[PDB]
Amino acid sequence: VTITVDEYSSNPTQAFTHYNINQSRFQPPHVHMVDPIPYDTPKPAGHTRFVCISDTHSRTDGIQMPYGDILLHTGDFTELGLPSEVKKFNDWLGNLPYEYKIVIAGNHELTFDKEFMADLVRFPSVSKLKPEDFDNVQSLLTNSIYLQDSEVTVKGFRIYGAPWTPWFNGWGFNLPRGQSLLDKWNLIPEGTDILMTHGPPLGFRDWVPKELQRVGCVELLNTVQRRVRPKLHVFGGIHEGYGTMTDGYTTYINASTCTVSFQPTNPPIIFDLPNP
Ligand SMILES: Nc1nc2c(ncn2[C@@H]2O[C@H](COP(=O)(O)O)[C@@H](O)[C@H]2O)c(=O)[nH]1
Ligand SMILES: [Cl-]
Ligand SMILES: [Mn+2]
Ligand SMILES: [Mn+2]
Ligand SMILES: [Mn+2]
Ligand SMILES: [Mn+2]
Ligand SMILES: [Mn+2]
Ligand SMILES: [Mn+2]
Ligand SMILES: [Mn+2]
Ligand SMILES: [Mn+2]
Numbered sequence: 001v002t003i004t005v006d007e008y009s010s011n012p013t014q015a016f017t018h019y020n021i022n023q024s025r026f027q028p029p030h031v032h033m034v035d036p037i038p039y040d041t042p043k044p045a046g047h048t049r050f051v052c053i054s055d056t057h058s059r060t061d062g063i064q065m066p067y068g069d070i071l072l073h074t075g076d077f078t079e080l081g082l083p084s085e086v087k088k089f090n091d092w093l094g095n096l097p098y099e100y101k102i103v104i105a106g107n108h109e110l111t112f113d114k115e116f117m118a119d120l121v122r123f124p125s126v127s128k129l130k131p132e133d134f135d136n137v138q139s140l141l142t143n144s145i146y147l148q149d150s151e152v153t154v155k156g157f158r159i160y161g162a163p164w165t166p167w168f169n170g171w172g173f174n175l176p177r178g179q180s181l182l183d184k185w186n187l188i189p190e191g192t193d194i195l196m197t198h199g200p201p202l203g204f205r206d207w208v209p210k211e212l213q214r215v216g217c218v219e220l221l222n223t224v225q226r227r228v229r230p231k232l233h234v235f236g237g238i239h240e241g242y243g244t245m246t247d248g249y250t251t252y253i254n255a256s257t258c259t260v261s262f263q264p265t266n267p268p269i270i271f272d273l274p275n276p
């Protein structure tokens with residue numbers, strides 16, 4: 001399967017309507033919300049319980065974390081990517097019992113985006129940083145496996161992560177819709193079980209009420225549904241979209257911990273998958 005740039009790539013709201021009209025792509029019975037399961041749900045044997053969070057924005061102190069096996073964090077774990085914020089998040093991770101903690105960056109991790117940092121010469125406190133201050137920011141995540149257009153196999157699960165989102169404010173890892181993003185999604189390997197991205201695919205937990213617009217990536221949706229077909233696609237990005245959906249094969253989890261007003265009150269989402 002070769003994914004090409006969609007006819008409606010630049011206009012996600014129109015893409016959504018188009019695919020609903022022509023293919024019922026976002027319609028029942030196959031597409032629907034999935035209710036969360038409570039933390040005391042027994043985990044069946046031969047399964048891994050994934051604890052999904054995102055968009056914590058350095059507000060980790062009060063988060064009540066559930067039993068599980070592997071933590072997935074889909075970015076915006078800081079406000080500006082300051083090394084001190086990365087250190088605080090890493091300290092928090094180290095006190096969690098999970099066997100593995102897998103992390104990707106989001107747009108707020110400015111110091112992780114080396115092209116953004118170079119272009120700096122809007123962000124006075126980030127501009128103050130000297131090269132030696134942030135040459136090792138990802139190295140600061142000693143209690144995690146950090147993914148960036150890269151993958152890890154853990155307990156047999158193939159997990160791929162990438163930070164890129166459609167251009168919004170020119171913050172970290174922003175790219176134009178279309179081929180620029182498709183070039184990144186084409187790196188996701190076919191047999192990926194769990195895909196982590198910072199933002200949503202078109203149509204799944206990507207509604208922005210203030211704009212009355214869908215904002216998910218159309219190339220990402222086509223990649224997920226047509227080429228890669230992971231069992232789980234976890235992301236955040238659009239805080240308002242916190243919650244879970246399915247298309248009948250892939251489960252889509254918007255794990256945004258913060259609300260749109262940056263209150264860290266959305267509970268972590270647990271999700272069980274059978275071990276491969
Ligand atoms: N319209 C629009 N809003 C976005 C986009 N990305 C983020 N936002 C808005 O900004 C909020 C916070 O995003 P953040 O600055 O933490 O990346 C999101 O919950 C959403 O309301 C986007 O691509 N388009
Ligand atoms: Cl939605
Ligand atoms: Mn229900
Ligand atoms: Mn965020
Ligand atoms: Mn250094
Ligand atoms: Mn923002
Ligand atoms: Mn596949
Ligand atoms: Mn696989
Ligand atoms: Mn598999
Ligand atoms: Mn974000």
Ligand SMILES: [Mn+2]
Pocket residue numbers: 029030032246248
């Ligand atoms: Mn169903």
